[PDB]
Amino acid sequence: KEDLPKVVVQGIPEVSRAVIHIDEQSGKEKYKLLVEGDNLRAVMATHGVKGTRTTSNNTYEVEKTLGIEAARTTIINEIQYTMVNHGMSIDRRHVMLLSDLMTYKGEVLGITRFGLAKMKESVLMLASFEKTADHLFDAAYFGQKDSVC
Amino acid sequence: SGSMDKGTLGSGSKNNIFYILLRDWGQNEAADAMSRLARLAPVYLSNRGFSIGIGDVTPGQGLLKAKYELLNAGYKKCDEYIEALNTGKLQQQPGCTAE
Amino acid sequence: TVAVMSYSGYDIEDALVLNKASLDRGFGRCLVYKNAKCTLKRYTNQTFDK
Amino acid sequence: RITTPYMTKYERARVLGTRALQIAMCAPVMVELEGETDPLLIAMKELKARKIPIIIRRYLPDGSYEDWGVDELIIT
Amino acid sequence: QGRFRGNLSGKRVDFSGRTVISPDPNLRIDEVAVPVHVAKILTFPEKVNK
Amino acid sequence: DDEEETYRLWKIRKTIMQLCHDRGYLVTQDELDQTLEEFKAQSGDKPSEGRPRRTDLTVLVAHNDDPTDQMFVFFPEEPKVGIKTIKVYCQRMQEENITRALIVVQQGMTPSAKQSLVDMAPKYILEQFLQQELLINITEHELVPEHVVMTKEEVTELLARYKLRENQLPRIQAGDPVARYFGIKRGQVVKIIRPSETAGRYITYRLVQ
Amino acid sequence: TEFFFHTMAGREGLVDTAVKTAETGYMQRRLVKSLEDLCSQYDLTVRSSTGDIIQFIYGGDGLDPAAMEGKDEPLEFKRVLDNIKAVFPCPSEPALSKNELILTTESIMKKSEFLCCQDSFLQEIKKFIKGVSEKIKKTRDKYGINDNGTTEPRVLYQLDRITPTQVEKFLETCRDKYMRAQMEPGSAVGALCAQSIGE
Amino acid sequence: MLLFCPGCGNGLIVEEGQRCHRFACNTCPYVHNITRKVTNRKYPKLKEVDDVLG
Ligand SMILES: [Zn+2]
Numbered sequence: 001k002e003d004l005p006k007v008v009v010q011g012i013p014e015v016s017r018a019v020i021h022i023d024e025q026s027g028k029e030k031y032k033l034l035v036e037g038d039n040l041r042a043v044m045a046t047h048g049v050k051g052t053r054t055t056s057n058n059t060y061e062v063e064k065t066l067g068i069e070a071a072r073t074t075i076i077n078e079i080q081y082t083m084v085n086h087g088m089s090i091d092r093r094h095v096m097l098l099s100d101l102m103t104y105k106g107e108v109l110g111i112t113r114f115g116l117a118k119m120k121e122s123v124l125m126l127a128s129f130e131k132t133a134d135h136l137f138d139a140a141y142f143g144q145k146d147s148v149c
Numbered sequence: 150s151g152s153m154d155k156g157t158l159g160s161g162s163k164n165n166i167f168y169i170l171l172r173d174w175g176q177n178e179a180a181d182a183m184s185r186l187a188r189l190a191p192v193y194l195s196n197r198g199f200s201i202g203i204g205d206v207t208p209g210q211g212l213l214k215a216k217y218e219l220l221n222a223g224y225k226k227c228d229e230y231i232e233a234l235n236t237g238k239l240q241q242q243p244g245c246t247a248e
Numbered sequence: 249t250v251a252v253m254s255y256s257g258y259d260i261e262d263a264l265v266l267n268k269a270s271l272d273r274g275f276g277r278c279l280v281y282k283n284a285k286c287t288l289k290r291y292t293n294q295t296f297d298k
Numbered sequence: 299r300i301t302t303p304y305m306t307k308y309e310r311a312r313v314l315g316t317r318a319l320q321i322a323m324c325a326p327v328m329v330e331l332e333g334e335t336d337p338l339l340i341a342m343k344e345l346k347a348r349k350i351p352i353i354i355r356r357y358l359p360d361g362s363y364e365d366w367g368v369d370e371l372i373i374t
Numbered sequence: 375q376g377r378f379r380g381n382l383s384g385k386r387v388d389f390s391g392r393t394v395i396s397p398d399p400n401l402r403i404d405e406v407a408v409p410v411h412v413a414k415i416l417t418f419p420e421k422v423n424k
Numbered sequence: 425d426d427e428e429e430t431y432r433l434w435k436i437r438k439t440i441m442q443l444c445h446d447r448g449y450l451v452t453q454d455e456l457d458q459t460l461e462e463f464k465a466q467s468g469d470k471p472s473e474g475r476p477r478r479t480d481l482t483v484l485v486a487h488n489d490d491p492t493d494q495m496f497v498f499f500p501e502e503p504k505v506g507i508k509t510i511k512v513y514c515q516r517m518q519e520e521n522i523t524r525a526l527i528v529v530q531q532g533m534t535p536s537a538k539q540s541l542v543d544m545a546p547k548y549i550l551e552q553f554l555q556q557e558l559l560i561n562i563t564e565h566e567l568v569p570e571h572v573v574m575t576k577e578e579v580t581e582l583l584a585r586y587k588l589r590e591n592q593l594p595r596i597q598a599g600d601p602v603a604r605y606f607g608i609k610r611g612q613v614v615k616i617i618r619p620s621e622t623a624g625r626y627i628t629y630r631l632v633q
Numbered sequence: 634t635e636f637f638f639h640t641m642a643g644r645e646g647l648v649d650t651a652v653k654t655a656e657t658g659y660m661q662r663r664l665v666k667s668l669e670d671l672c673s674q675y676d677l678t679v680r681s682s683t684g685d686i687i688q689f690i691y692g693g694d695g696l697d698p699a700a701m702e703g704k705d706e707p708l709e710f711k712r713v714l715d716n717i718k719a720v721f722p723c724p725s726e727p728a729l730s731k732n733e734l735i736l737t738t739e740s741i742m743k744k745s746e747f748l749c750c751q752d753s754f755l756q757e758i759k760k761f762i763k764g765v766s767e768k769i770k771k772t773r774d775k776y777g778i779n780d781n782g783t784t785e786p787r788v789l790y791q792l793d794r795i796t797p798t799q800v801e802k803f804l805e806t807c808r809d810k811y812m813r814a815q816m817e818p819g820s821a822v823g824a825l826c827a828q829s830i831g832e
Numbered sequence: 833m834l835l836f837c838p839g840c841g842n843g844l845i846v847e848e849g850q851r852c853h854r855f856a857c858n859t860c861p862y863v864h865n866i867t868r869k870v871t872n873r874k875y876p877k878l879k880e881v882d883d884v885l886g
Contacts, residue, residue, distance in 0.1 A: 005876055019244070022886030031884065044560045047428055051560035055567065062567070065557075067602040068630075069616060070567040092621070092705055093692030094826040097679070100688050101668065101823070106595040106633070111667045120670065121683055128378035129666050149682045163702065172702055172810075173716065180403055187399045191257025200253045244885040257399040301675050306817035322421040337423070356818075359674045359684065360587035374813065586678070592685055618693070621705070624753035626693035 012046075014039035040065050063108045072103040122146055158186075301356055301364065305371035310345070313352050313368060317341035345373065389416055429470050433479070434463040436528065436558045440481070440497055443605060446563065449495055450487035475501040475530075482520070496525040503531035510537055514544060524607075525550045528558060551604060562605050570617040571602055574629075579613045582629060593631040608632050661831030671823030673816050691816050694751065698829075700814040707754065707814050708807055710761040717803040718795075726796040730773070730780040731766040737797050738762045741804050754811050758804070769793040833872040837862045 015037035023030045035043055040061045044051030056062050057078060063071035079095045101119075102108055109115035113130040120126060123139040123146040139146070151157075157166055171179040208216075233239045234247060241247050255265050266276075288297035318337040321327065328349040331340050344350045348369040357363045391412045398407055441455045467473035476499060484495040496517060500509055505527065517525055525548070527533075533541070533552055541550055562568050574582070583589070590611070596603060598610060608614060610632055618626040670682040677695055679688040692698075696707050703709045729737065741747075742755065772793045778784055816822070835844040837857040844855040844864070855864040 019882060020884035022884050024886060041556055045556045047431065052564045053566055065601060066562055066565055066568050067600050068596055069569050069571075069602070069618070070565065073567045073569075073618075090829060091698035091701060093696070093698050094829050096692055097671070097688065097822060097826050098668070098830065101671065104594045104685070104687050106597040106600065106630075111663050116667050119667075125666070125670075128383060132376065132378060149684075163704075184402050187257070187403075191254070191399055194254045195256055198253060200251075202252070243883045258397055260397045260399070263397050301818070302812075302815065304813065306819065308817065308819045322423055324421075324423045356675050358587065358676055359678070359680055362587065586676070586689075588686070594686065620693055622753055623756060624694075626690075628689055 012037065012039050012042040014042065059108055063103075068103050068106055068108070071108050072099040075099040075102065075108075122149075299364065301366075303372050305354075305366075305368070305373055309354055309371075310373070313350060313354070314338065314341045314345060316352060317344060317350055348373075391416060426470050430463065430468065430473065431460065432555070432559060433473065433475075434458070434460050436555055437463070437479070439558045439561050440526075440528070442561055442563070444484050444495070446605075447607060448486055448488045449484045450491075451484070475499045482522075494520075494522045494524070496520075496522050498525060498527045500527065500529060503529075505529055505533050505537055507534075507537055507540060510540055510544070510550075513550075514548060517548060523547055523549060526553055527551065528553050528555055530555050551607060553604070557601065562601055568602065569619065571606065572615045572617075573606060573608055574613045574615050578615075582613070590631060591633075593629055595633045596630040598632055603632060657831060661827070664827040664831050665824060668823035668827040669821070671821070671826075673818050673820045673822050675818040677816070677818075679822060691822060694753065695816050696811075696814050697816055698825075702810075702814075708810055710758070710807070713806060713810075714761075714765070714803055717799050717806060721799055721802050723796045723798050726798060727782050728790045728793075729769075729795045729797065729800070731770040733780075734762065734766045734769065734795060734800065737800055738804070741801060747808060750808060750811060754807075758807060765793075765795075769795065 015035055018033055018035045018037070021032045021034045023032070033043075033049065037043070038058060038061060040054065040056045040058075043049060044054050044065075055074065055077070057074075059071050059075050059078070062074040076092070076095050076099050079098070080090070080092065083090050083095075102110070102115075105119065109118050116129060117126055117135075123135065123144060127135045127139075153166075155161055157164065159165070167179050167183055170182055230239070239247055259265050270276075290296045317325075318341040321337040321340050327340060327344075328351070329340070329343045329347045331343065334340050334343065341350070345368070350368045352368055354366045354368070354371070355363055356366060393409065393412065401407060438456075438458055441451050441458070445451050445456055467478065473479070479497075479499040481497040482494065484497065485491050486493045486495070498513055502509070510527075513525065513527070517523070527541075527550060529552065532554065538552065541552060544550060563571075593613065596614065598604075598608070602614075606614070612632050614630050614632070616628045616630060618628065620626050671679055671687060673691060674680050677690050678686050679691050680686050701707065738759070742758070747755065772778070773780070776789050776792065778789050778792075784790070835855055836842065837844055837860060839860050839862045840857065842857050842859050844857055846853060847856050848854075849863070849865070852865050854866060856862070
């Protein structure tokens, strides 16, 4: 009685809420699905959904589902849309360079200390940014020679 | 033709006259034009006079009448909506509740 | 006696233009008082600051 | 010969700085200055007259290099 | 306030000043007015040449 | 059922045909352009259709490289594939002397079966594919650009033009969906054609690592 | 009550700005610390400090965002053409027809100095030339202007007046602007991107 | 529903005896055999048919 009504009978378990958005273009009013879920593969695999034109906001799901280039394109589009929402414009070359830096090792790596450590190699910069003592002791243990490039 | 404003002399976006001078004739010409503007505009603005007073912000009689009519109409429509929601059924907009 | 107007372009952003004759006759004249304190204390030994 | 023939602003700044530092250290002048006590003004005059005896050594990332004269490059 | 952030990446230097600003439209956009008092303190090393 | 299941099977078969055509294998135009009516003519019901055997494909040969090279596509009927099914598929490929095979699972692969498939044999190359991923073609997606695997001559020309090394090129994981779609190995290079906002295109390159 | 509500709104704005200052400061610090290593090399390839390439060409084309005259475009061909017509009005040269304009454009574009230019910019120039030639043709068809140059009302030639001198000036100006708008090697593109995203 | 023993007031569970299903308490020999049908509906809220926006 505590969990029998809470069983899924139809739909994607990761999908929490889907709504029918409509575009009222003068030529034609078309219908699309706005899904507040975290499963892009399941949405594309469902019947009646044109998976060729399905996007998402979560860059990790796009990376895992449609490749690293689709993730880069999603990052670019999402950053540009978020910037335009506030009325301020940024040249596309900057966001393209940012997405390329985030997606040049084959995996979307963030700007946090973990992604910065996975991308960069210089010990001095890793120590100066965050986790000074830990990085310094790890470098002393590994004996990693750091250049001045 | 036309009158100068922020759309043409301000730092908003492109189509600025100083931007056109910078992109067409170099930096020195744009700097000289900006210096001439900054030395000319204050002189004329002081010799002509530009002031704001309490009379520049006071409302007119027609404005007061229009404001009164609009306030009355808006309050009547808001009271009608309140009465419709509290007593009876109110047309619920899509994607949201009645409140 | 403030007059709200633009004058000489030296009051572009929040600035104000003051009158020389007004400041010369005592308008805005201010006084700053500072304190300088010194101590001549007797130590444990029978000697003192002089 | 494959790089841009235009002389970049960074090259301009570095060449002017080196020339001003040299002239400040009793270097010979090749433009016959007329009452210019500032070495940077003399360096700019030499750059405009294209008489700076400095050759830029542009290095490619792999390791290759190429030499470009100041008079050979294009200034703006 | 560590060595990297407070003494390596960003550190204090000499031959510098800090002053309140005031408008002056009679100067070019690439020019800035310096007080005589600060100019007498901030010095520039010029090498004696011909 | 019996309506969505056959549609999923037809779409998976069409996606497999498109993948084989993109990889360079020999597929006729009829197999690439196969309507749902022809699939119903082959089999119109779920019990009539045979997932393990009626859908298997063995005519897949690399006509561009060598007709002797053969590739096989499997469709296990059970949702989770065990060790025994993998062993049966491997011994069947040994009987038919096939080195490259694909496994289209229905729900997933057990971790033991995954680990075994990883280290089956260097000569026996088998790739795991979920039916959920194969319901939509990754190449036809608007976000996914055009990827073309470059030959060794083109990679040499690139490295000579840019005076680069292999490790200096941008990396792309082997587990990438596009990488598994094309079946590219470590050391190969893929040229990517990004469609720009204007009429031009941006050419980039990525090394599998 | 209205004054109290206005003070509430003002305090909400103040606390919003107070939080935004610190949040964007931290974001800017992170972005700059991450992006400060990239630099534009001389081979038009953006590489990191270790030598790994991030982009084979910056922005796909290689143009300076600071020198971007149009809306993410290098030049606004209409404004450049109008400026060329206004600065150099040649009254002693006859107007050009559609065929003559296309011919002189194809003759000038095939020179050596235009070979090193990118193909996309040349295609855009050709598209703009074809568009303006179609406009001139439509005007001459509307007003019956003859390409021989013997029409009695000469003011009709002032509607869409173009001379080969103006064509050459426009093409040379566009080529020079495109050459001077490219990324100068050695620029710290990563720091500029970090700042232009954080601000 | 929630039922309690009249004897001690503890919660009653449903078990199976030798003849029929019965309510029983875990701290006293009190039992109660079920004679007729007993039901406890809850009437869960129906997933309101959402409307299209835009
Ligand atoms: Zn009891």
